[PDB]
Each structure stands twice: as structure tokens, then as C-alpha cells.
Swiss-Prot record, chains A, B, C:
Gene Ontology molecular function, alphabetical: identical protein binding; nutrient reservoir activity
GO CC list: protein-containing complex
Subunit text: Homotrimer.
UniProt key word Signal: yes
Entry keyword annotation includes Oxidoreductase: no
Protein's recorded name: Canavalin
Job description of the protein: Seed storage protein.
Domain Cupin type-1: 4-162, 182-330
Native species: Canavalia ensiformis
Sorted UniProt keywords: Seed storage protein, Signal, Storage protein
Length: 344, 344, 344
């Protein structure tokens, strides 16, 4: 059917309690060979209720963290000290693999929802988190060292070590608690009219992204509006439905196939580069895109007034290309006065 | 037998009519594990009769285009306009993935033959072309969008859209029609004597090539001449027999094996880096090489006067290496007065 | 059991006679999917008795050569001449693929032991050596060319060619014989106290390494000493036991698993990035590490005074993380006065 659609149900729950949850999307190339180019990436979703803390741990992968909702205090621990960041909705930050960090939702009434995009390199497609704390879920990884190794390391009797560090205290890793971030809308939208806006941050313009060769964008569309047919020349975009519902039509050659699907909050659709795509906001809509192989990407439109490549074909060639006359093709293309987003 | 030989019959025909044809070579790692390093590349061959045009379309891959015969007008369509290039034999140009373009053979008596080297990244080993026009072969990809999406996009009744853009007109994509190119011989040959010449353009000296890490060369040899045993330290060269016949001897360790083969026009032989190779022109010969993993490649010769690494081994070591005496090895190596190409 | 342990018996013998031997470690991803990231590398070990020479040959791979014992004269042959290097214990040098070279152990009483780290790119995971000389083992690769090709190439009768170059002389490639090197201890150890020292050279500080994205280190520990629990954020370290015995404890998440093993001279253990590790010198110990994916690597300690990330966690957070009180965790961490290496 549609190898590019990942409904929230394809998300596997890693941990969850009354305070929040962490889920991991199935591998992109899990059920298909078509998404081979996405094998090194995993998408995780973290949600926590007000006044909670994700216990300290480090990941074996580089993480691109995005606040989709709420606000957080993020602390990064270095051997020599620590950095604290207050993250607001739309803020993004890269967490280099191996950095222990903890996350707090300081709000007293609002939930925190974070999207974590993981770039794996140790074990391709695999992401592991090492928690410093022993819980019902899993004991501290420090408890795996032998007693003799533990005693010599800390220069203390094992009973001391075990009672202070190893013994199980919390039940889970989310507990009720008693480089710098950049926001996706930190710049003018690259597309903007009465029907919608598109914010985009490319690796060419952000040092954090340059290393990862990833682009991020924020799409906001008024109900009924339509993002007209276009395609990206290089980037494959993982599109996440954050708020609202979207009707998407992706055209691909595998023969000519139309993959139509309606996305709901939490659903995900991957848009391969070169594949024409178009989408309709069934309700007011907000989506976040993460495009890999982003460097030097260009968006080509097939309809509308601005950046419409069809409108650049000489008439004597348009004429041989389409059934209509050169003049006819021209006039038709002239009919849509709007650009990028139009009334659907 | 020979996992490195690709006779023209391994070429699959994608499209063909009275005006021309487009063929695609089978994947290099199709029948063997030895050409793993070449999985991301595909070779296509395009041929068209005089006064024809390859209808507009874009590819999902970056293409390195090489005119092996004839001349062409190549037009690249950008969202903001278009670039036109007149390409002559030996001219090469990189077409970035996602760029719609059309090709014309303006000549009235001569055929156009182009070799397209594709660097894939969306789906490794796969190349797809999206044609704007509906033909007997395949309908426009625009016809795959839903009627409601089409009408809102162009702001016109579907009948208008269908009659002007979607309805099938041409029968095929080649129709009888009523960054800048660089030529392979744009510089002095790096090897040249009475028996042959070798033109070479490396990524170190050409910006278009630097990005792809590919080198191109043009080999022209007089019948009977011999390109003496040598090997490339880093680049694996895909050698295309353009004109004439060549007897090739490639030595490889898989044990010690001699792969001997006679190539005819259209045949292809891959020369793995480090493998000694030598070839004889059975007739006046012209071949084009495309070497991947090209950066910093060095050609080491095992015979002849210049660049003969054997001649650099100290005599007390030559002596322990070969059956003859140090002096004897030296004298023998001294016998061939010529370099690179010799009388066969 | 332990997918990361490679005892000397996993080494396959390529060649061996009374003068020395060359062995090749099995592919890292031979028996497991966990070491996928190491598929492009092979480890070879070369040992030769006093007054021997490894006959001239070139490799299809880039080699990082390390003298683990003894001394050698290494000659690199270029088309235009040759470079000679005298290598002492601890010296390292990169040999670019395709460079013919020979090795000599000039000492009259001491054995030469070299470790060759190969970075493959022609055929991933595969390494081939092309020897110029015909031996009982394998004939010269030049003997594979046809007689007519040989005669025209050297401009001499085949009998001459065969008698001087091709006929078998030596029995094997090690015969009794009648860019520049950098030493691993060419800089102050990055860690050093009464129990041990750690020398490290990163790609950031050495041009030869920068290209390969590899780091090298030399570890020397007094018997009884302990390299406390820590982990590398990016580099996966291939640890070679050069002298002495080590008790190693590697903790990994596959669930929480402790891989304990005692290494003897010649044994090898791979330490994946992010996996906590600790090791004890059962005897005075010297190990050499080769870390891939080295750029920007950071070592995080979990015990000891300096660079202990645990000691950077705020007390109100330590408190929620561990069973003990914030003050208690703090005090315990304060107990070990030493750093990096401690009395075991």
C-alpha cells in the first residue's frame, strides 16, 4: 500500500508511567527497501506531565531535540561542569552522543512534548540510552561492574557504594519532581501568504545543522488551504503531523503510483526527494519537517505563479510536451494568481 | 568467468522508437559481490536520430552527461529561468538531481550519442525519471493528482486542465522536432607519443568533478599499439569502448587470475584499483573512462621507461626479489625505450 | 557470550616460514551484527626474525603501520623514486594504498613485530597484497600477462623475461637478507600518575590521522593498577594487548550485560563508544588502542576526582537519581583522591 506512511501506532512504547512516556518509531527500513537511505535515523517521542524530570542518562547517538509543545529546562553534563538551557516551543538543539543530560518540565499546568531525531553511527539504526539510576525497569549500569572493581574505583566499602548509588530507589525514569537552542521561527517564513506559512532552516545557515546535513521546517496552514504540487531536489523529508489533519497526495515511480493518505496528530509521512507532493489542511494545521541529505536542496513547484518550473519551458517546447498549444499551456499556468499555498 | 565485463547486451532498453533510444546498464553488483563499491552508480546510454528532442523530465539522481558522438542543445530549467548549452563531442556536464531538462539533436544528418553516468542517493542503485508528458509509455505524473487537487492548484476547471496538460499527445518521449560544459580534450594529454594519447581530468582540477570524486579520461590508440601494464592506486575505472576494438588483460587476486577479453563498440570493462591491467588496440581505438574514488589517484607502471616503479627498486633488493641479478633486472627494464604506449 | 573479544586464535595465518609470519584477524562483523561499523577494517600482524626482508608488494588498502616491537627500515617506492624510513618501537606511519614497499628488520638479535591496521575501500572488508615476486606460494602477478603482451611491453624475448623476472626464486615472501613516522609517545601522556599513563594522538592533532578519522593511544599500567570506569563518546576502540595481562569489564546494553574477560598478549577487545569500561592490570601492562570514528571524541569518567561527570550533577538532582542523599552521593564521590588510574 504505502511504504511511506507511519501512523502513531508504528511507535513502540519504551517506557511509560503516570508522569509521561518515551516511544520509538519503528525503523524506517523495517518493512521496506525503499527507505534504505533512512536506515541510520530513528524518531523518538517524549511526553511528560507538569513538574517532572527525565532522569540523567546519555545516548549512544547524536540527538536533535525539538520542543513540539510546552517548555523545558535541559541540562547537559560535561566532565568539567554543566550547561542549562530553557527551551520554548519551536526551539531545537543538538545533543552530541555521550553527553549525560536530564530534562525537566517546569510548568505546573502544561504538558511537555518533545520530538527526538536520532542520528546513529555506533550500531546503524540502533539507539541505546544508559541510565545512571537503578529502577524497576533496569538497574544502574554501574551495578554491572564487579564488587572489587567498584570498591577500588570509589575507594569505599561495597555496602557504602550499594546503599548510596546502586540500590533501587525510583520506580521509573520519569519522576515527579518536588551550541545553544534555536527556534524554528527565528526567521521570516520563506513562504507566506493568506493561506499559510513555511519556516525553514537549512544547514547552510545553521552550524548545528551543517554537521548533520539536515534541514528543519515548520508548516502552518489555515483549514482548507492547499500546499500545491512541488518536489524537493535532494532532501527526503520526514513530515510529522503536529496539530490538525492533512490530506496528502504523494506521487511516486516505483509504475506511476498515487499514495493518498489523511494524517492525524502524531502520524508521519516520509517524502522522498524528486517525488511530487501536495497536501491539504483539513483543519488548521501545523507540521514539522526534518529533511535529511539537505545540503543544497531546492523546492520546485509545478503550479502557482512563483517558482513554477513549468512556466519556464519555451513555448515551442511546451507545445511538443503537452496536448495544448504553447499559448494555451501558458494561459492555463497564468490562471492561479497565488503562490505556494492556495485556497483548496 | 569475468565479473568485470559488461557487454552491450547487459544493457536493458528503457525506451526506443524510430527516433532514438535510452538504455540502462544492469546494476554493477547485480551478479557479483566484487563490485560492491559501485552499487550507487548506473550507466545509461542515450541515442537519437537527427532533429529530435528528448521530452522534458527530471531525474532523482545527479547525472554526469558525456557526448560520445554528435552535438546537442541542452536546456536546464530552473524555477527562475533556464540555461541553454551547446554540447559538442567530448563535452561533459553535471546535471544536478531534480533539474528538469530536455535534450535536442540539432544536426540534420548526424546521430547524437550520449553516455549518462548516474550517481544515486535517494534509493541506492536506482534511477527514476519523471516525465512531464503523458505518452503511450506512461501518463504525465501530474495526472496522478486527484481532480480536486488539480483544479484548486491551477484555478481552472478539470476539463481545461485535462485537455491542456494531461491528455496523451506524443507516442513516446523522443519526438521528431520540426556550471558549464568542459571538454575531455580541453587540456594537453597526460600521456602522448607516436602510439597513443591519454587525456585526463581529475577532481583536483575541475569543480564539477570535485563534488563527485570522479575522474574522466579519453584514450585514443593507433591500431597495434599497447598501453603497458600498470594499475591505479585508488580509482576504479569504468572503461567504455567507444570506437574500435581492444584486447584487454586484467590481472586480479580473488588466487592469481587473468581475465582476458576483447571489447567491441559499446562493451564495458571495470578496472578495480590496484589490479594490474594492459590493453591492445586491435584497431584504431577510442575509449572513455570514468573513475570513481578518484581523489589523489596515481597510475603506477610496471613496464616502459617513465614512471616505471619497478625501476625504482635498489639493486640489492631487486636481486632478492627476482631470479635475475640486480644488474640483469636493470638492463631488461632498460630495453623498452618508449613510455606508456608502445608498439604491440 | 562476548561478541567483542578476539583472542589471538581468531587470527588466520596468511604466510609463515622460519623467518617470520603474517596473520590476518577475522572480519569484525564475521560472527556478529554488532560490529557493523567496523566492517571496512582489518587487523594484520607481521612478525619477522632478525635480518629479514618482506619482499616488495603493494596493498589494495591504506595501511596504518605500528611498530609494536623491534625496529625496521621501511622503503616506499614511487614512480619517480623512493623514501626510506627508519622506524622505532612506537612509531606509526600511514602507507597509502597502491604504494609498493618492502620491510627490513635490520637488527641482528631482536625480532620485529608490526601491527597493520587496514582501511579498505575497493572491496569492503577485503585486503589483497600483490607481490612482485614468484614464490612457491604464488607466482609473480606479472606472469599472468600473456607472452605477447610481456614481450611487447619490455621489448625483449620471452625467454629473457621469464629467466630474469618470472621464474621462481625465493621460497616465500620473507627472506633472510644477507608523510613521515610519528611516535605514540611523541607527546606528554594525557593521563599520568603513580599507577599508569595514557598517551593519545587524535586526528585533530596529526595530519596522517585526520584523513582516516582515527586516534591512537598507548596505555601503560603498573601491575595491580585500575583504569576506572569511563566511556568514549564517539570512538570505538580496538584494544590490543601488547605486553602483560588485563582483566577487563565492559558494560553494554544489547539488556544490561557485563562482558568480563582476561586478555593475554595478542588478545584483542573492541570497546564500542558509549559502553562503560574498566580494566585491571594483572601484570605490568602495555596496550595499544586504535579508535575509529575518532574526531571530537571525549572520554567521560564515572569515578575518581578529575573529569568525573557524576560529580557535576546538582545535588537536588543527584538526590532524585540515586538512593542516597545529595550530600551522601557527593561525599562518596569525594572518597577517591586519585584520577584515571588507581590502586586496584
Amino acid at each position: 500500500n504505502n511504504p511511506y506512511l507511519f501512523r502513531s501506532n508504528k511507535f513502540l512504547t519504551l517506557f511509560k508511567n503516570q508522569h509521561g512516556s518515551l516511544r520509538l518509531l519503528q525503523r524506517f527500513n523495517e518493512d521496506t527497501e525503499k527507505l534504505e537511505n533512512l536506515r541510520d535515523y530513528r524518531v523518538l517521542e517524549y511526553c511528560s506531565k507538569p513538574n517532572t524530570l527525565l532522569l540523567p542518562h546519555h545516548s549512544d547517538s547524536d540527538l536533535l531535540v525539538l520542543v513540539l509543545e510546552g517548555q523545558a529546562i535541559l541540562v547537559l553534563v560535561n566532565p568539567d561542569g554543566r550547561d542549562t538551557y530553557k527551551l520554548d516551543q519551536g526551539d531545537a538543539i543538538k545533543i552530541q552522543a555521550g553527553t549525560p543530560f536530564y530534562l525537566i518540565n517546569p510548568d505546573n499546568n502544561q504538558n511537555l512534548r518533545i520530538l527526538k531525531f536520532a542520528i546513529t553511527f555506533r550500531r546503524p539504526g540502533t539507539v541505546e540510552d544508559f541510565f545512571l539510576s537503578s529502577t524497576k525497569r533496569l538497574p544502574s549500569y554501574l551495578s554491572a561492574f564487579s564488587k572489587n572493581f567498584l570498591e577500588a574505583s570509589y575507594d569505599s566499602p561495597y555496602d557504602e557504594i550499594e546503599q548510596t548509588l546502586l540500590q533501587e530507589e525510583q520506580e521509573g525514569v520519569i519522576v515527579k519532581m518536588p551550541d545553544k537552542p534555536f527556534n524554528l521561527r527565528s526567521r521570516d517564513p520563506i513562504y507566506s501568504n493568506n493561506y499559510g506559512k513555511l519556516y525553514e532552516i537549512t544547514p547552510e545557515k545553521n552550524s548545528q545543522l551543517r554537521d548533520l546535513d539536515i534541514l528543519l521546517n515548520c508548516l502552518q496552514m489555515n483549514e482548507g488551504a492547499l500546499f500545491v504540487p512541488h518536489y524537493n531536489s535532494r532532501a527526503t523529508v520526514i513530515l510529522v503531523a503536529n496539530e490538525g489533519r492533512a490530506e496528502v497526495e504523494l506521487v511516486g515511480l516505483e509504475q506511476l503510483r498515487r499514495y493518498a493518505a489523511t494524517l492525524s496528530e502524531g502520524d508521519i509521512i516520509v517524502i522522498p526527494s524528486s517525488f511530487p507532493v501536495a497536501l491539504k489542511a483539513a483543519s488548521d494545521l501545523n507540521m514539522v519537517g526534518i529533511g535529511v541529505n539537505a545540503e543544497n536542496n531546492e523546492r520546485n513547484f509545478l503550479a502557482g505563479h512563483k517558482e513554477n518550473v513549468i512556466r519556464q519551458i519555451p513555448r515551442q517546447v511546451s507545445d511538443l510536451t503537452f496536448p495544448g498549444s504553447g499559448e494555451e499551456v501558458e494561459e492555463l499556468l497564468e490562471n492561479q494568481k497565488e503562490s505556494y499555498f492556495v485556497d483548496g
